[PDB]
Amino acid sequence: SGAIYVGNYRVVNRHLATHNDWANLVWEDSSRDLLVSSTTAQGCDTIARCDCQTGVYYCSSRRKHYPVSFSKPSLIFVEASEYYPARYQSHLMLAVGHSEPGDCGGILRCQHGVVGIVSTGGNGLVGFADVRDLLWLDE
Ligand SMILES: NC(=O)[C@H]1CCCN(C(=O)[C@@H]2CCSc3ccccc32)C1
Numbered sequence: 187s188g189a190i191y192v193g194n195y196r197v198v199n200r201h202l203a204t205h206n207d208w209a210n211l212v213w214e215d216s217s218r219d220l221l222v223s224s225t226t227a228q229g230c231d232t233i234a235r236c237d238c239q240t241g242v243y244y245c246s247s248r249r250k251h252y253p254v255s256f257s258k259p260s261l262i263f264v265e266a267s268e269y270y271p272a273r274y275q276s277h278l279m280l281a282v283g284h285s286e287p288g289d290c291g292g293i294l295r296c297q298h299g300v301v302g303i304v305s306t307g308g309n310g311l312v313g314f315a316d317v318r319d320l321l322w323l324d325e
């Protein structure tokens with residue numbers, strides 16, 4: 187679990203969105219596993235606007251942060267789960283690292299701010315849904 191709070195927005199994994207996220211929906215994309223809802227309170231997270239390929243992510247199943255090198259956002263084939271059929275997930279970045287069910291929503295950050303959130307795992311890999319292209323989060 188986990189979300190990004192920026193301005194009057196909350197960014198969560200679409201498969202973990204609550205009834206309240208859907209009732210205050212701003213934007214959602216099943217192909218990215220992202221959903222953004224509006225909030226009454228002001229958020230203070232900073233979103234990176236960069237092309238970093240190194241950063242640090244939070245892994246809740248280890249209560250630890252890990253440094254990682256990650257691939258550029260791309261279309262990656264993801265196996266069927268209870269939330270989605272087998273499909274290509276877009277804007278996904280992979281790194282070698284630990285991630286298991288319950289780790290989605292962990293923030294990946296570089297020196298410029300928030301890069302994305304954990305969205306996939308297994309096999310000694312961890313996948314992050316990129317949010318750096320969502321320039322509207324800052325306006
Ligand atoms: N973005 C998606 O399509 C997600 C939806 C939830 C299920 N997905 C996983 O990757 C899960 C949880 C993250 S960790 C993990 C480790 C081993 C096997 C599977 C998983 C795919």
Ligand SMILES: [Zn+2]
Binds near residue numbers: 234235236297298299
């Ligand atoms: Zn950066």
